[PDB]
Ligand SMILES: Nc1nc2c(ncn2[C@@H]2O[C@H](COP(=O)(O)OP(=O)(O)OP(=O)(O)O)[C@@H](O)[C@H]2O)c(=O)[nH]1
């Protein structure tokens with residue numbers, strides 16, 4: 091009746107408790123919460139460290155989850171790396187919030203560091219029976235996966251379908267290449283000192299007849315999830331290289347071409363040798379290619395990236411840290427990284443210049459970047475006012491809608507490139 | 511001859527069965543084991559659920575351990591929340607390890623008391639015979655020490671005996687009593703370290719640092735006795751003592767000498783958890799006739815970046831009083847630039863690790879140069895800590911570091927000596 095490994099109640103027992111909780115709810119109009127907790131990227135840990143460590147980490151997390159709740163509450167392992175939590179007898183519906191953060195914050199400390207995404211389903215608001223509530227909380231949890239990770243999300247009518255949609259995309263992504271469904275769009279970069287074009291970024295567009303245009307931000311995670319990141323990443327790299335190689339012949343220089351590089355790709359053994367090859371074929375000087383690695387990966391409290399990163403520098407490729415400013419980071423480790431560029435996350439820029447918090451952190455990032463001799467570029471710049479603000483504050487480069495949204499090669503060349 | 515409540519054999523009966531086993535062990539030349547099991551944080555269980563439940567829990571625990579062992583094996587209640595176990599016949603010492611874990615995993619599942627089920631844990635010490643002793647008392651003693659070791663190296667764990675374990679266990683107990691006494695007899699002492707400004711060259715304040723000398727043990731370092739306090743629940747009493755005395759002295763100094771900057775005091779993580787902190791702090795200031803502006807509370811980064819929603823609201827409350835807030839040991843590990851701004855900080859203290867390498871080390875320079883730029887941008891009074899050499903102070907000045915603190919200025923001084931060395935008349 092209890093999970094042997096963790097000693098926690100099983101799915102069955104839980105649903106018995108939830109029923110009593112539901113009776114309690116309708117008898118004494120006292121709302122409740124069902125939280126679904128799934129661990130962030132646990133396979134990589136099982137492979138990286140082996141079951142021995144895994145089975146242990148689960149026991150540890152189990153305990154720490156219990157130590158965060160009251161005796162009235164219930165914590166169960168639902169199977170796999172998934173814990174379902176029952177908060178009955180909430181005085182107010184908003185209480186589930188404070189208890190959610192506690193649970194999420196239990197993971198901030200170490201155990202070996204792991205993370206988890208939480209989905210909240212309130213009752214009876216979001217369901218009046220066990221299967222429905224469990225099903226919804228899960229759907230919420232998936233939305234936390236959808237929106238980055240290591241976060242909590244609430245259930246909303248729509249996001250049950252959004253969850254099953256993402257699942258569908260994973261299988262279709264396998265056919266993406268066979269069908270001519272992948273494209274590269276290009277976005278210009280602007281330096282504020284001068285008024286000149288200083289480079290561009292390649293973005294991956296995936297089209298599907300059922301689901302329409304899929305966004306790059308949502309595309310890569312999917313490719314990672316279904317283990318196609320390598321094959322797809324290679325396709326993206328090569329086509330980026332090809333495009334730059336072509337432009338070098340039919341158009342005047344505008345700087346380097348930028349591309350997102352997934353951690354999984356950084357983990358490959360033949361990457362550096364692969365890139366050499368690709369750069370040679372297109373007749374490209376290595377520095378003409380810029381690889382963007384997202385901060386959250388680099389700052390996973392495990393400096394496994396250094397080794398490879400230096401190789402890429404010895405190759406001559408430019409390295410940029412992407413989506414910087416959010417979450418946790420290490421200043422010590424930030425300097426040890428051979429980076430040329432630091433990209434300011436959109437979130438902080440979208441608020442410029444009105445919001446003082448965003449403005450405050452933008453300055454901090456700007457000043458931090460110059461101290462560590464890194465070129466600072468702001469991404470998501472949407473208004474002339476933001477550009478002006480960033481210009482005074484001494485941001486070096488901008489990228490976003492003020493200049494141009496992503497464009498197809500032809501339109502991009504047509505609009506921004508000159509002859510030579 | 512049996513524990514009434516649990517139905518388990520008491521220590522007298524256990525002793526005879528241990529003695530008999532020892533006899534067989536000598537002749538037959540066979541190894542054995544005595545295991546000491548002490549429930550983990552069971553006081554909290556009684557506090558939150560009450561004896562009636564705790565008794566049922568003990569009864570439940572006792573019965574589950576019984577099931578985990580052979581017939582030749584015997585489980586006994588030594589007394590309180592402590593159980594003791596004997597493994598008479600072992601093929602080899604390796605076998606004891608195996609049996610120890612069995613008993614651990616028995617605490618994995620929760621235990622059933624009335625309607626509910628609660629999880630309890632335990633620490634386990636192991637003593638082998640005749641390796642670790644050939645008589646009952648020393649085997650129990652040594653097995654107990656290992657339990658205390660398991661108790662100190664963490665919990666819900668197992669530990670084997672080692673020659674040095676007994677002393678460590680007693681010392682830890684002694685230091686507790688001595689701390690408890692010192693705290694209760696005002697036998698701790700505050701030392702004071704000056705802070706200088708590089709922008710001017712005049713005093714900018716001072717830090718109050720807790721010291722503890724004991725003739726029998728000598729100077730007990732804070733690194734040693736603060737965890738002790740945290741472990742045996744004396745940190746709240748300690749922090750309160752530190753605050754009051756830190757205030758008193760400053761107040762007294764407000765009258766006697768002239769204003770020389772504010773006084774900084776470290777605020778342990780748990781002190782922030784105190785619900786009455788703000789109420790209590792205000793009184794402390796009022797009593798000493800100290801403007802809140804005169805007092806600064808230093809809080810370690812590692813803790814503040816681990817903070818919750820309850821912590822940020824308090825930090826505001828502390829500012830509402832007018833006291834200054836400072837982030838201590840800054841830049842070492844992983845932190846959040848986003849969360850750093852939302853804090854109403856006034857001061858930023860650069861960790862001693864980055865400043866002790868100045869200026870020869872290239873990395874430590876880059877980071878120190880970064881932290882200054884960071885603090886400046888956020889409008890935070892940046893201050894170097896642990897400044898030892900002149901070359902280090904030089905560097906910090908050419909790199910725009912506002913304030914400074916360390917041996918280069920002066921080591922922590924006793925009150926009289928401080929007042930006589932850095933303090934001028936009202
Ligand atoms: N060590 C251990 N691993 C388990 C256990 N149960 C499930 N897992 C692992 O948990 C992983 C589940 O991964 P998913 O939830 O599919 O995806 P993920 O790798 O966690 O990454 P996300 O998609 O971010 O959740 C699998 O690799 C399982 O082998 C267990 O009892 N012990």
Ligand SMILES: Nc1nc2c(ncn2[C@@H]2O[C@H](COP(=O)(O)OP(=O)(O)OP(=O)(O)O)[C@@H](O)[C@H]2O)c(=O)[nH]1
Nearest residue numbers: 548549550551552553554556561564565568590591
């Ligand atoms: N209900 C009940 N409680 C008992 C009995 N005997 C001892 N206890 C409790 O067991 C607790 C023993 O606490 P300690 O061993 O001093 O420390 P702890 O709180 O267990 O924490 P540790 O440092 O991990 O041992 C006390 O709070 C006692 O009240 C008993 O017969 N019945």
Ligand SMILES: [Ca+2]
Nearest residue numbers: 128129130171
């Ligand atoms: Ca998972």
Ligand SMILES: [Ca+2]
Nearest residue numbers: 128170171172
């Ligand atoms: Ca899962």
Ligand SMILES: [Ca+2]
Nearest residue numbers: 291350382412
């Ligand atoms: Ca990017």
Ligand SMILES: [Ca+2]
Nearest residue numbers: 548549550591
């Ligand atoms: Ca105990």
Ligand SMILES: [Ca+2]
Nearest residue numbers: 717776808838
């Ligand atoms: Ca300090």
